[PDB]
Curated annotation (Swiss-Prot), chain B:
Predominant location category: cytoplasm
CDD domains reported in the protein's UniProt record: Era (cd04163), KH-II_Era (cd22534)
Tagged with keyword Signal: no
Ranges for region G4: 121-124
More info: When overexpressed partially suppresses the slow growth and decreased 70S ribosome phenotype of an rsgA knockout; RsgA may be involved in 30S ribosomal subunit biogenesis. When overexpressed partially suppresses the 30S ribosomal subunit assembly defects and cold-sensitivity of an rbfA knockout; an era mutant missing residues 39-49 fully suppresses these phenotypes. Overexpression is not able to suppress a rimM disruption phenotype nor a C23U mutation in 16S rRNA. Also suppresses temperature-sensitive mutations in DNA primase.
Protein name as it appears in the record: GTPase Era
Region (G2): 38-42
Effect the entry attributes to changing residue 14 to V: Confers sensitivity to cold
Regulation: GTPase is competitively inhibited by GDP but not by ADP, ATP, CTP or UTP.
Residues annotated as domain KH type-2: 203-280
Signal peptide: none
Provenance organism: Escherichia coli (strain K12)
SUPFAM superfamilies: P-loop containing nucleoside triphosphate hydrolases, Prokaryotic type KH domain (KH-domain type II)
Amino acid sequence: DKSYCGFIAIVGRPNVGKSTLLNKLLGQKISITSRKAQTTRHRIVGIHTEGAYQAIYVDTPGLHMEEKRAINRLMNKAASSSIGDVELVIFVVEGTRWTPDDEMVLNKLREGKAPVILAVNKVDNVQEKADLLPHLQFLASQMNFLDIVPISAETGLNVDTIAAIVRKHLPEATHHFPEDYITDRSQRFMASEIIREKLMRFLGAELPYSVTVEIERFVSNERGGYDINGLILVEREGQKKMVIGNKGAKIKTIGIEARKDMQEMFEAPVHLELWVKVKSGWADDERALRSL
Amino acid sequence: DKSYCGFIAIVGRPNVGKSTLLNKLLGQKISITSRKAQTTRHRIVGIHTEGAYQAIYVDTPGLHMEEKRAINRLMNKAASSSIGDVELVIFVVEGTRWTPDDEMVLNKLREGKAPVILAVNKVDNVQEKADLLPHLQFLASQMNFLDIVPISAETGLNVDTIAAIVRKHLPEATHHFPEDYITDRSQRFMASEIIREKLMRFLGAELPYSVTVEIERFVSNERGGYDINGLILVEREGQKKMVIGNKGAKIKTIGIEARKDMQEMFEAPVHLELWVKVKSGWADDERALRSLG
């Protein structure tokens, strides 16, 4: 009978695992991690809808009036239509690291009426726990966190835990967005989206969890046309062989079919270059082929 | 800062002026009056958005849960997403007429939490007011109407007044719908929509502040294809002469362009038959041109 919907923040200095945490929270089988300097004007970074709950994830602790009108334009709603406020904040930090950049973010939060969760990422990396406890005690000394939760974004350590608090903070309200609305309407996202389907379609029963599509390059040329470079990141090594398939079949197909739509959708032929890769890093041979 | 949005009803027995009153409220220059005896599952009949206010006009006094689930689907929202309730009701009646149908509607209303405005339509068409006063006093005995207001079907007598009470009844809330959302996603509406553009594109606003498009026919054949019949309705006579244009050029163009998008925007071919008409009834020649095919 009742539904809940609200905005939630995910802040932290760059390269802390924010994007990885977001994808785990969005709960999509095949995710789409973009690398944009092109900061949205609405700051929406993803929307998780499930049952009566709709959490709208933003990358700002507080939503400006400017950001409120932009969210409305995104929804094609009157600029005057009411938009709430951030109800929770997930402050992500990296293990035992603490730069003036981490403080910069922390400084912007404390000065708010929104509760904040400290998400300590890559906590397993710190092989010297003798660094951890002292650190965590120093962190908690920075402000009153609603909670301090250590996570592994690539394992989903305490993502369910953060998922639960997040929902507890969704105010009673009607959803602002239709279920599968797109906040990224760029061609670059359209591209990632076509690859995503081809993987889902062609991998079939062999699709593993945690796959991530991403456009490393989308451009035109001095000779004209659309140069698109797809990056299909996977968790394991053997998984990488799946996406590639027998003789290179599966990755061949996914690429022709994906290129097809990229052309049917966009209005220009595209030279699509699809690269499978394990998130832990390229391999020797791969690093070689990546230079050819 | 604040914003308001809520559902409002427009009830009444058929052929009373509900559709005309609605278009007047929607405030659109060129309106699109359907005739869909096919009743929606969401019951949305139109949405008036302006500034922070968004009134969602339905054709049911009260929204059933089923009618709520359908509204969400229309918006492509989770079935669970909250939908409010009818905050006001416009019960339109025809002049001095009162059938068991008028009563049927009024009975459903009597029992409800929704304030209801009595809209007396075609009031200027009553043969003798000596029928009106006794009637009204008898209507106002049926229940406590928030207000009793007489309106003119095509003049928009007190449409502003009904508009102003309607907005007063919009609860504080966020707009459920994007500004220009379409509640009718049928091809029949897509057609009406194309003629609207062509009128707006070619008439160039020289246009009658009250034109009304309408698909009088949209079908297939025993021989196959798409038989579409457009009905462009205007107020005055010269207006009709405007839409037709010199040598019949304007109406010729509006139809080739309209037929085109209907050709493309739909997958197959269309036999578009566009007919201009004054709402006050056809003419002799026209009736002659119509009475054949």
